Design goal:
The structure is cut from a larger assembly and holds 6 copies of chain A. In chain A, the strands form 7 sheets. A 7-stranded antiparallel beta sheet of chain A has the order 1-4-15-6-11-12-13, with no helix packed on it. The first copy, chain A, has a 6-stranded antiparallel beta sheet with strand order 5-14-7-8-9-10, with no helix packed on it. The first copy, chain A, has a domain of 223 residues: Spike glycoprotein, N-terminal domain (Jelly Rolls, Sandwich), CATH 2.60.120.960. Chain A is built from 4 helices and 30 strands. The longest helix of chain A has 9 residues. At the A-B interface, loops of A face helix 6 of B. Strand 2 of chain E pairs antiparallel with strand 2 of chain F, so a sheet runs across the interface. The complex binds a molecule of 2 linked components (NAG-NAG) (5 copies) and 2-acetamido-2-deoxy-beta-D-glucopyranose (NAG) (14 copies). Chain C: This is Spike protein S2.
């Protein structure tokens, strides 16, 4: 059974005096002329918050219970008017919903011709109550008229309420985020209100911030045709990308002769990388790693080598040092991801592994010519200030962490410009035409 | 068209032409009188006699020369048509109203292509590529 | 949203601008994905127009005057009740009764008084922009020094606006060298100025100036005008007492007294009506004037919406200052809009980054206000230059510029002061009861072609007369009424008649 | 804030704590130790010429 | 308090007129501004130098 | 003291250009207001952050100048349109518009040039040495009312 809510259920939104003024406010409110359910009890959802009312002059309706379960397993609100007081606690109560006559505990508190009305809401970790009582002349539907509800209680309790029930005629409706214009009189009371979304005249009243509007034409709003459906258009590839051939390659290259693998014509899944506990670092520049599965790329290039753990900080745009200045450089506008891990469990050897060595953007140079560090034209002869250009990392299993070998992979992304060839795992839809749609072509949303 | 719109005028061009027609028909049939009350009819050769007294030329000068004065007028309105038919650049004042508004809207639209120092000039790139904490800065 | 006023009805019509009606109920509206714009698939009727889709108005094939303007020639109104939409009408159609020998001459007149309202000055204002931006906080004020001259050329701009409002006021009212004052007796030939002259029981404003003053109704500071409302009223009193006792002469030299009925006889010659027309109709002319001033009191008693220009200056000054104060509450992307939160929640190195957002947004908000004030002051100055010109040409003179000093042929006008502006009571002669006559450009006598010296030839159907052009008064045609040039043959439409030689 | 605190005639409802002006500036308060209402004024400022 | 001008009761009556018996030729000077100093600013050179 | 309108045109433009130049010395939140300090002290990735503060401040400084010049140009155009109208009406004619071409009944006027402006010497008739007389609207002769032509 349902009933029209009329202009019921407005409350003082803040503890502020205002007078002879119209105030525009946004809050969880009961929308005007909404459908409010009627009852003569069941457990009910709490949703965003509740407006509750009853015909009452008897205390046949003793109170309310609230929580997730509203029963035993966790803290739950019990509220009862026992005629001596309002009695409140938030305990893990196991008792049944029939304590009344036939007519832990982390917080506790104590304090027909008539209708009694209430609002319950739970915001910023605090549980709030507002109320009113009035004489009336109809029991079978809510009174058509205006009366603002004022606050009672504001508990610090933090409970994640999702359900409630009545304890033994009564009416229930749900609050929604809406904008209202409230009329404060000379003595600080709300005396009238406009629900701005109710109709185009209420939009006009709220646009003007006035309860009357003159003859005329007023722009109140903007109109758009909305999307009927969501379309995804991606290349029809099913081949998975060979990332194991990069991240689990048997031998990694030197930092001076870093190795490049092209990745192409495949469906990638970067979650297979990003979810892995294998990586000591994982950082992305022009993209966030959480977004990678939504994208598609013309090319992906994996560049990889082994390097000393303390130096791994140089594998970023804008850095400088021996590895960055002589071995390998990213451009300072780099779009991609850098990944590395401590590889002392594989790369080291007891004499220091002599195979691993160090000396514009994306340059590589393997030339063996001597560093002529001195004024001497060294002419292929080593000596004071005449040295072979490569030096070796002393990678042995006993090394301290900054001196250990680390394995490095850098993924460089060629964006969508030409038709793309490496995509995330997005399922293509059928194509729809002449209707308004949301769309996604290879990541172009 | 990125939230830009053009609203129509209230008076359409056929309504503006009905007003210039009414002004011109009042002027020809009644002289200045329709501006100071109700229109009072007067013969056009007799309205021009009052226009001649208004410049300090005695009104017999018009009637003694009426066919000459009428031909000098009719020939002068011929030259207006030839001038406007030849020389569209006479309307340079009105055409600059059109050109200034077109330049202003083209500059407003072209400024959507600018980065202003963000990752991209395109808002859907930023929202596709970056997660919320990083995207808000762009 | 088109509204009859909630005073009148709660019915509305809705216009979707530039939209096609086939799209409207398939959108944010009605039977598709609908953000907030709740259902009315039809409000009662749906009607495509060049302005857009119109919902809830009833199309009509009549054409009324435009009540509410929709655009592209469409208007809307409330009628037998429903909201209707129609193509507007420009006015009543009139085929003028022209022919090459018919003339219409007015046989009677009405004195008309019309009210023109002009803005003259804004409210003066100045802002302590350090106290607006930083609220007397020392950490903010040290950051605000990095911006240089900005919060100093803002005050230089507002000072130019403030000084101009006193100039605008002086250019209009201070057009008189001496404070002229009215005689003790009021024998102005039966004209009755008592409702526009100063009231000794009242500031000492007139009765109509009291209606006009009743009907118009931080770091920031509002400054007083240089001339008080009692000084402005002494200037309008001096202009008015000079005008009544001396005609235009107080503008060209020292005021020369003249009797008011003789001043009005000069005002009648100025519009080309022969001065005996006033002395022969003096009581009727005086009654039409006294009656017309009575209607101004009633019109200004009935509504405040007559003074909508002056009430707009009041409303725009208030709206601009309320917006400038409300913009203190905005974040501009900062962690809080309350400057003491930022200073207490954060260490200096983080606080200075968050405070510079509030400085940037408040400084931009204040530059936006001052730019808008400079643009608005230039509009008020153009209106003060017009009011100063109407004072010289309408009040101190008798203008012969069409429609400058009201409709009809101008006689005189009177200034009354009002809040932020001036009101001119423009008095004009309107011709009122025309008759048709036959006319000829010339008359032929003894071969000589005769033309009237002043006036026009007319006939009642049997006799020929010469008459003045703006008031029917026929005279027998004589050698003193006419002059000769040449013989009959040159003149098109000449007629044969007697010319008397006294 | 800084201001001149003063006695007032304003009629706050029993739950209301402070008052706001038309532009949302706070301009009255309830004293929490004796529940009467104070009216708040800015401390005087102006140009020096 | 500033003075608006000398106070003057004009000698009005229903049958009295004043007529000037002489004149003075008066030459008055009026000054009007007509043009600003023409400027150009190269914003690449102003902003970036 | 008379030519203060034309001297104010010179002063308004001089203050505007000197304000525009002085704002080059402002930091706007950079480490220095001198652009070569940033470029010599800071390497490129650090330097761009500081330069963009000077770009933002110097660009806002120049937009503020050009906007106030556009409003000031419209004010001078209204004055040049009045001076052009005064030359047609007062110099090329004899204007009957009260107080348009000086106080008193206008006879003629003469243009003289002045820097950034124009000066009109307006020649007017001012009446003087008035006397009181008895006056009447009309005269009765042979039972008929006479009025002056
Ligand atoms: C081409 O050869 C030049 C040397 O002739 C290389 O120059 C070095 O580039 C790195 C870049 O970080 C600098 O740190 C070194 O200081 C440069 N060396 C000298 C002696 O100037 C350059 O890297 C080579 N470019 C490519 C694309 O291989
Ligand atoms: C000119 O118009 C006026 C009205 O504006 C006429 O005056 C009225 O005359 C009738 C009698 O005919 C009286 O009942 C009214 O009381 C008069 N009104 C006023 C204000 O006096 C006047 O008669 C007309 N004159 C002619 C010649 O038609
Ligand atoms: C000038 O007109 C005013 C009305 O506009 C006359 O004032 C009214 O006079 C009558 C009769 O004495 C009184 O009943 C009214 O109360 C007066 N009204 C006001 C507002 O004062 C005034 O008498 C006329 N003056 C002359 C000299 O006749
Ligand atoms: C045209 O005007 C003349 C002069 O006013 C009219 O002639 C007079 O007519 C009246 C009767 O209406 C006679 O009593 C007079 O004796 C006539 N006077 C003269 C000098 O003839 C004439 O009637 C008017 N014509 C029309 C058609 O109205
Ligand atoms: C005005 O009067 C003259 C006579 O005074 C008219 O002249 C006559 O016109 C007819 C027709 O053209 C001729 O046959 C006669 O010979 C003319 N008579 C004389 C004495 O010249 C003249 O037509 C009259 N004008 C009008 C407009 O009727
Ligand atoms: C819902 O509320 C409206 C009034 O806003 C009412 O007309 C309608 O019948 C209600 N629907 C139901 C199913 O109760
Ligand atoms: C109501 O509750 C209080 C404790 O909160 C208890 O002391 C009192 O006896 C109760 N009254 C009744 C009538 O049950
Ligand atoms: C009391 O709280 C603890 C956690 O703080 C929980 O383990 C225990 O089960 C709770 N007991 C009851 C009866 O709710
Ligand atoms: C509410 O739920 C959140 C998880 O969304 C949890 O962190 C919080 O501790 C809960 N609080 C209570 C008191 O249930
Ligand atoms: C406001 O309060 C006063 C007493 O303070 C009371 O007399 C008056 O009736 C009230 N007015 C309204 C509109 O409630
Ligand atoms: C590398 O090999 C391990 C098993 O040895 C596997 O779990 C992991 O997924 C592989 N890496 C990638 C990128 O698949
Ligand atoms: C409606 O407005 C008109 C003026 O627009 C006014 O005359 C009328 O009295 C108003 N109606 C009501 C009920 O006040
Ligand atoms: C409106 O839209 C329909 C298609 O839905 C089209 O046929 C019709 O011509 C359009 N009318 C106008 C005036 O745009
Ligand atoms: C209104 O005009 C339309 C054509 O524009 C016509 O079809 C319709 O019948 C007319 N209705 C009336 C009542 O005149
Ligand atoms: C003049 O006469 C014609 C008929 O001859 C008539 O149509 C017209 O309305 C009359 N005009 C006046 C102003 O009386
Ligand atoms: C006056 O007009 C009529 C009709 O146009 C014409 O027959 C007649 O010849 C004209 N008379 C004169 C003198 O122009
Ligand atoms: C606060 O305490 C004092 C006594 O210490 C008492 O006089 C006063 O009324 C109290 N005020 C409130 C609001 O409790
Ligand atoms: C007129 O004024 C001049 C001085 O401007 C004087 O010399 C002359 O005598 C005066 N004439 C008369 C008749 O007053
Ligand atoms: C005119 O006469 C009056 C007295 O009737 C006198 O006050 C006034 O000064 C005289 N004016 C002149 C110019 O003589």
């Amino acid at each position: 059974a349902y009933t029209n809510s009329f202009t019921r259920g407005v409350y003082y939104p803040d503890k502020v005096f205002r007078s002879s003024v119209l105030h525009s406010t946004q809050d969880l409110f009961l929308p005007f002329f909404s459908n409010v359910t009627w009852f003569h009890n069941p457990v009910l959802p709490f949703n965003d918050g509740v407006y509750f009312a009853s015909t009452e002059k008897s205390n046949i309706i003793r109170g309310w219970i609230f929580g997730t379960t509203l029963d035993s397993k966790t803290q739950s609100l019990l509220i009862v008017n026992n005629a001596t007081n309002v009695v409140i606690k938030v305990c893990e109560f196991q008792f049944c919903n029939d304590p009344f006559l036939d007519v832990n505990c982390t917080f506790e508190y104590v304090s027909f011709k008539n209708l009694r009305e209430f609002v319950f809401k739970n915001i910023d970790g605090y549980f709030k109550i507002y109320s009113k009582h009035t004489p009336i002349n109809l029991v079978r539907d809510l009174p058509q008229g205006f009366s603002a509800l004022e606050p009672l209680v504001d508990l610090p309790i933090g409970i994640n309420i999702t359900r409630f029930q009545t304890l033994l005629a009564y009416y229930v409706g749900y609050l929604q985020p809406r904008t209202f214009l409230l009329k404060y009189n000379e003595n600080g009371t709300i005396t009238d209100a406009v629900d701005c979304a109710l109709d185009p005249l209420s939009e006009t009243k709220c646009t003007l911030k006035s309860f009357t509007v003159e003859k005329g034409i007023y722009q109140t709003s903007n109109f758009r045709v909305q999307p009927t459906e969501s379309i995804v258009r991606f290349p029809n590839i099913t081949n998975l990308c060979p990332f194991g051939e990069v991240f689990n390659a048997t031998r990694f290259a030197s930092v001076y002769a870093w190795n490049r693998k092209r990745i192409s014509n495949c469906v990638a899944d970067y979650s297979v990388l990003y979810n892995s506990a294998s990586f000591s670092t994982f950082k992305c520049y022009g993209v966030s790693p959480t977004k990678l599965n939504d994208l598609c790329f013309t090319n992906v290039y994996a560049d990889s080598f082994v390097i000393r753990g303390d130096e791994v900080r140089q594998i970023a745009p804008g850095q400088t040092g021996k590895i960055a200045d002589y071995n390998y450089k990213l451009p300072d506008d780099f779009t991609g991801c850098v990944i590395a891990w401590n590889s002392n469990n594989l790369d080291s050897k007891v004499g220091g592994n002599y195979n691993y060595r160090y000396r514009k953007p994306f340059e590589r140079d393997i030339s063996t010519e001597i560093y002529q560090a001195g004024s001497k034209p060294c002419n292929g002869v080593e000596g004071f200030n005449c040295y072979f250009p490569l030096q070796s990392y002393g990678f042995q299993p006993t090394n301290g962490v900054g001196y250990q070998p680390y394995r490095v992979v850098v993924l460089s992304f060629e964006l969508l410009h030409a038709p793309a060839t490496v995509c995330g795992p997005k399922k293509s839809t059928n194509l729809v035409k002449n209707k308004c749609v949301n769309f996604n072509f290879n990541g172009l949303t | 068209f990125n939230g830009l719109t053009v609203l129509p005028p209230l008076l359409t061009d056929e309504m503006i032409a009905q007003y210039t027609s009414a002004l011109l028909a009042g002027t020809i049939t009644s002289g200045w009188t329709f501006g100071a009350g109700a229109a009072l009819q007067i013969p056009f050769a007799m309205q021009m006699a009052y226009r001649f007294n208004g410049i300090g030329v005695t009104q017999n000068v018009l009637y003694e020369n009426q066919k000459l004065i009428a031909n000098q007028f009719n020939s002068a309105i011929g030259k207006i048509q030839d001038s406007l038919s030849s020389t569209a650049s006479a309307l340079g004042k009105l055409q600059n109203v059109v050109n200034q508004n077109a330049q202003a809207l083209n500059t407003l639209v072209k400024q959507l292509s600018s980065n202003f120092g963000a990752i991209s000039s395109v808002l859907n790139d930023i929202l596709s590529r970056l997660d919320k904490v990083e995207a808000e800065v762009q | 949203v088109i509204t009859p006023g909630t005073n009148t009805s709660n019915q509305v019509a809705v216009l979707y601008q530039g939209v096609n009606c086939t799209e409207v109920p398939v959108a944010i509206h009605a039977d598709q994905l609908t953000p907030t714009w709740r259902v009315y698939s039809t409000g009662s009727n749906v009607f495509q127009t060049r302005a857009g889709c119109l919902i809830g108005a009833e199309h009509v094939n009549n054409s009324y005057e435009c009540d509410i303007p929709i655009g592209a020639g469409i208007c809307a109104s409330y009628q037998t009740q429903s909201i209707i939409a129609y193509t507007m009408s420009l006015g009543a159609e009139n085929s003028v009764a022209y022919s090459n020998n018919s003339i219409a001459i007015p046989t009677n007149f009405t004195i008309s008084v019309t009210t023109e309202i002009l803005p003259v000055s804004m409210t003066k204002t100045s802002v302590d922009c350090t106290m607006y931006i930083c609220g007397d906080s020392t950490e903010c004020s040290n950051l605000l020094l990095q911006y240089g001259s900005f919060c100093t050329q803002l005050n230089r701009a507002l000072t130019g606006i403030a000084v101009e409002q006193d100039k605008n006021t002086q250019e209009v009212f201070a057009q008189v060298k001496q404070i002229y004052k009215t005689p003790p007796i009021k024998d102005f030939g039966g004209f009755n100025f008592s409702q526009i002259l100063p009231d000794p029981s009242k500031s000492k404003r007139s009765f109509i100036e009291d209606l006009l003053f009743n009907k118009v109704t931080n770091g920031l500071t509002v400054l007083p005008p240089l001339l008080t409302d009692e000084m402005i009223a002494q200037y309008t009193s001096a202009l008015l007492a000079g005008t009544i006792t001396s005609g235009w002469t107080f503008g060209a030299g020292a005021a020369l007294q003249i009797p008011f009925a003789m001043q009005m006889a000069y005002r009648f010659n100025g519009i080309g009506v022969t001065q005996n027309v006033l002395y022969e109709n003096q009581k009727l002319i005086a009654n039409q004037f006294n009656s017309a001033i009575g209607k101004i009191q009633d019109s200004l008693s009935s509504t405040a919406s007559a003074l909508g220009k002056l009430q707009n200056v009041v409303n725009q000054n208030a709206q601009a200052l309320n917006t400038l104060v409300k913009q203190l509450s905005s974040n501009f992307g900062a962690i809080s809009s309350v400057l003491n939160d930022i200073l207490s929640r954060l260490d200096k190195v983080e606080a200075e980054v968050q405070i510079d957002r509030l400085i940037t947004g408040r400084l931009q908000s204040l530059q936006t206000y001052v730019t808008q004030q400079l643009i608005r002051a230039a509009e008020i100055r153009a209106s003060a230059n017009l009011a100063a010109t109407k004072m010289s040409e309408c009040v101190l003179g008798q203008s012969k510029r069409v429609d400058f000093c009201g409709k009809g042929y101008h006689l005189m006008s009177f200034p009354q002061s009002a809040p932020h502006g001036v009101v001119f009571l423009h008095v004009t002669y309107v011709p009122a009861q025309e008759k048709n006559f036959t006319t000829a450009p010339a008359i032929c006598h003894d071969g000589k072609a005769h033309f009237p010296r002043e006036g026009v030839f007319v006939s009642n159907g049997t006799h020929w007369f010469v008459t003045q052009r703006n008031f029917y008064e026929p005279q027998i045609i004589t050698t003193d009424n006419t002059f000769v040039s040449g013989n009959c043959d040159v003149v098109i439409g000449i007629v044969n008649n007697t010319v008397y030689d006294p | 804030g800084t201001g001149v605190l003063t006695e007032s005639n304003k009629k706050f409802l029993p739950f209301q704590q402070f008052g706001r002006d038309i532009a949302d500036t706070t301009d009255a308060v309830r004293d929490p130790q004796t529940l009467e209402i104070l009216d708040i004024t800015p401390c005087s400022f102006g140009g020096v010429s």
